[PDB]
Amino acid sequence: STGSATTTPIDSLDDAYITPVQIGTPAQTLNLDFDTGSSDLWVFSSETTASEVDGQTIYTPSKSTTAKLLSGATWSISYGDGSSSSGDVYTDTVSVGGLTVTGQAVESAKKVSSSFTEDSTIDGLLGLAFSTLNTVSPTQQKTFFDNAKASLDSPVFTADLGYHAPGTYNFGFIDTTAYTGSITYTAVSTKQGFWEWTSTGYAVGSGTFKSTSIDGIADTGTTLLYLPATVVSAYWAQVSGAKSSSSVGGYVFPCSATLPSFTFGVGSARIVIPGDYIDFGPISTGSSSCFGGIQSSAGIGINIFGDVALKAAFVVFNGATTPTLGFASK
Numbered sequence: 001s002t003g004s005a006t007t008t009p010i011d012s013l014d015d016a017y018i019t020p021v022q023i024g025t026p027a028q029t030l031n032l033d034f035d036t037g038s039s040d041l042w043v044f045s046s047e048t049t050a051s052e053v054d055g056q057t058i059y060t061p062s063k064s065t066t067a068k069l070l071s072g073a074t075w076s077i078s079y080g081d082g083s084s085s086s087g088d089v090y091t092d093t094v095s096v097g098g099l100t101v102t103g104q105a106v107e108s109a110k111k112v113s114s115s116f117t118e119d120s121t122i123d124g125l126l127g128l129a130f131s132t133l134n135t136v137s138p139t140q141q142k143t144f145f146d147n148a149k150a151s152l153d154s155p156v157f158t159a160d161l162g163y164h165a166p167g168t169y170n171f172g173f174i175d176t177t178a179y180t181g182s183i184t185y186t187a188v189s190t191k192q193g194f195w196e197w198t199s200t201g202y203a204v205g206s207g208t209f210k211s212t213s214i215d216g217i218a219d220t221g222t223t224l225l226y227l228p229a230t231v232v233s234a235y236w237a238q239v240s241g242a243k244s245s246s247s248v249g250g251y252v253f254p255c256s257a258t259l260p261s262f263t264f265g266v267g268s269a270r271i272v273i274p275g276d277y278i279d280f281g282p283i284s285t286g287s288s289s290c291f292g293g294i295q296s297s298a299g300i301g302i303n304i305f306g307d308v309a310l311k312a313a314f315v316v317f318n319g320a321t322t323p324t325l326g327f328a329s330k
Contacts, residue, residue: 001151002172003099007034007161010121013280014307015223017161018121019169022095023106024064030057030123034169035221036159036195036317037304039133039143040077041094042085042107043124044116052112055120061108067092075107075135080222080300083115089136094144096126099171101148105134105141125221128157128317133193145171145319155319159220160330161311163277179314179328184269188323192302194219195317197325199305200265202227204235209263209270216303218310218317218325224280225262225273225308226297235262235294242292248283251292255282262294264309266327273312 007017018031023043030043044053046060061067067090076086087110094104109116109124116122127134131142149155152172160178161167168178189196194217203209214227232251236242238260242253253259259275278293293308316326 001099001148002153002170003095003097003148004168004170005097006166007169008166009162009164010119012164014161014164014311016122017167017220017307018123019096019126021126023059024061024092025066026064027095028057028059028064030059031121032124032126033122033221034126034128034159035219036128037217037219037221038077038079038125039127039129039131039193040075040107040135041105041124041126041144042075042077042087042109044112045087045108047087048109049111052117054117057123059106059108059124061090061092061106064092066102067106070105070136070139070141073105073136073139073141075137077135080304081115083113085109085112085116087111089141096144096171097169099148099152101144104144104147105136107136128220129195130190130193132190148172149319157317157319159310159315159317161220161307163274163311167311174316179330181329183314183316183326183328184266185316185318185324185326186266188325190323194302195323195325200267202231202265203263203270204238205260207238209265211265214264214303216297216305218315219304219306220310222304222306223308224304224306225294226300226304226306227294228303229296229298232294232296235260236292244296245289248289248291250295252283252289253292255288255290257290264305269327271309271313271327271329273309277308277312
């Protein structure tokens with residue numbers, strides 16, 4: 001089997017991407033944030049505290065003939081941005097792009113933090129990291145990918161995120177029309193439960209490539225590119241008037257600037273992030289200070305190749321017995 005679904009930016013900045021997902025029988029379609037940095041499929045639901053719902057579409061298990069309470073199971077998750085959610089668990093049929101999994105754990109939110117409530121466009125998350133990070137207790141649950149894997153034509157999914165445009169998540173096949181050149185594969189460590197890999201270095205603009213190992217995760221659920229402070233300082237030093245602002249919470253730059261590109265290494269291959277991908281626009285409406293898309297990871301504890309980086313590539317998440325990542329230009 002295979003599946004193919006379009007993923008759409010939630011706003012003009014590409015802050016996140018939503019992908020429609022069918023849950024239950026008859027189908028209830030929710031727009032979920034596919035997150036390769038977490039491992040829970042959770043939704044706004046009929047159980048979510050009413051004051052914490054503001055415009056989201058909810059899953060109502062009582063209207064699904066295939067829903068079953070997963071008795072005693074609870075979940076609770078905290079994300080790197082300080083957001084959180086928790087609740088109870090149903091199993092139900094879940095389809096993405098024509099690929100169906102029966103008995104998928106659908107984590108029903110009873111509580112969500114303010115950032116979720118305030119984002120009316122995101123109806124929940126669909127985690128695509130390794131199932132070792134799933135938060136369901138007392139019986140940990142599998143991701144949609146892990147449940148689908150054995151049925152897929154190939155044990156893979158691919159992320160093809162757009163810059164200010166829709167893109168695609170495919171499951172079970174590699175669309176050889178979706179990228180240019182060849183795919184470079186690189187080793188993955190699953191020790192922390194992430195798609196963790198080591199970049200071979202970077203360049204700023206037309207500068208020379210610096211060969212250096214940068215361990216980090218491929219995380220579709222993170223907007224920006226978070227890298228070591230040395231790398232980030234080297235990038236922003238090439239932008240007149242850029243500075244790190246403790247008041248704003250990262251590097252800002254004059255909105256009048258033209259940003260340089262940023263290149264990262266994947267083995268001997270190179271992925272180039274155009275400068276415009278690094279512009280996240282005014283820090284507040286009407287400001288002439290703009291927020292940068294490359295930020296320091298120093299206060300995180302891990303480097304994160306988030307959407308800024310991933311949308312410059314066609315990315316293969318290879319879930320074979322020995323997992324690997326692949327990157328191609330596009």
